[model samples]
Target: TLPKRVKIVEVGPMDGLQNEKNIVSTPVKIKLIDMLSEAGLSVIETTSFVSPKWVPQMGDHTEVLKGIQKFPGINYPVLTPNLKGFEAAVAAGAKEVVIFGAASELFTKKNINCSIEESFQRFDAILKAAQSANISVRGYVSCALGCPYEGKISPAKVAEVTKKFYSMGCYEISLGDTIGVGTPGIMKDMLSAVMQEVPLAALAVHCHDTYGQALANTLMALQMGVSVVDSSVAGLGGCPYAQGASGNLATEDLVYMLEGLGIHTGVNLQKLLEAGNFICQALNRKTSSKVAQATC
Candidate 1:
């Protein structure tokens, strides 16, 4: 049985728009975040404090962090790639941050300009600093199921990275199929492998929909007792480093499925669609969610 209620982590403002060909204005970015918060999402990933030279879309990370209204009882977590990025985010008033590493050595180096072991050295420092500041740190393991460059990543490798993150004091670890190449079988296998080493309460899944399997794969996760999911509003993010990858599973679609299963997510489907439509219109793109399309 699935959990009575699940938490959905909305990542539109950062991951969704990070690779958009057209840069979304700062006001709109903040507006999207504010709207998601108001739509009753308890956790929304605000933005990534990465180098402007790398992700121009998130160049205004500080501005976005400073400008958005802080809703009561809501958590806004920003992505901090390394020690420098973590320092920048904490300096800008980030209370929660996410650090990510990949299971594949090649993908890790290509994405972050460092080896897997080297990336952990950076994250270790970030973890130490977060502990000093009492900040909550979430961990992400990309290419958990499959990698564009590495093809199929071993489940043991995924579990190893996840174990390291958990042992290092990350409150939660999100396993990401960065290339959207996983099906239900692999999702089950991967989660089983990771669950052996990590507690079920601390695991979340991040799936890409390049092959139209994101929803199914996520359902597999839910069935396996994962209570947290990572989705982008209107399905807006893909890895710039992972070629031919698509956006994340749309929030609207995930909520729709959860509701149909008699599960509670505390997300207003109507309000979420409003947020989804707003961003899609702002970006001048079509909605990637079937629920929105069928209703719109």
Candidate 2:
């Protein structure tokens, strides 16, 4: 059974827009985040404080961060890849931050240009600084289930990396099926191993819909007592490394499913749908969310 309530982490602004082929303007991103906050998202990932050379699409990170009106009860977190990114995020008024590491060695080397162990060392510094500044830190473990380059990942490896992040003082850790290759059986075994080292309450699941199994895998995690989920509006992001991987689980779809199961997300499905529609209109692309299509 799913929990009575679940905390939904809105990742549309960052993860959703980062891989877009068209460059979204700062004003557009700011408006998108504001709309998401108004839709009752308590936590919205605003932007990624990465270098322009790396992700030109998010080069307006500073402008977008400063432009938006932050809601009183809402937490806006940005992805900070290194000390430089962390400093930029802090200067831009970020009160909460997220750092990413990969469980798959090949993914780590390709994504971050370092081994998993070396990547943790980098995050150690970022976490220390964030802790010193009293900024809440969230950790991300990508390729938790499978990797484009490495194929299947071991559940034990995921558990070990999760434990390392928890021990590093991260308030929460998000496990990402980066390539969307996880099945219910694989998800159960993965969570079973990770939950042994990390508390279920402090864990969040980030699934992609490449194989159309995200919802099913998420249901398995919920049955295992995970109450936090990460999703993007309109199903806006896909894996750059995994060619056929689809977008993140759509927020509207997840919320609709949870509500049908008698779970309270404290989200207004109509308003969330409106937000998704707004962005879809802006990008001139059809929403990947099945719920949006059904409702529209």
Cα lDDT of model 1 by residue, 1-296, tens digit: 58889999988888899868889999999999999987899999999999999888999999999999999989999999878889999899999999999899998778878999999999999999999999999999999988888888898999999999999999999999887889999999999999999999999999989888899999999999999999998888765655655679999999999999989888899999999999999989888888999988
Clashing pairs in 2: none
C-alpha positional error of residue 126 in candidate 2 after TM-score superposition, expressed in Å: 0.8
Off by over 4 Å in 1: 238-245
TM-score of each: 0.97, 0.98
**Best TM-score goes to which candidate?**
2
**Segments in model 2 whose C-alpha atoms lie over 4 Å from true places:** 242-245
Best by lDDT: 1
lDDT of each: 0.91, 0.91
Q: Residues 21-55, candidate 2, lDDT per residue (tens digit)?
A: 77777888888999898899899999999999998
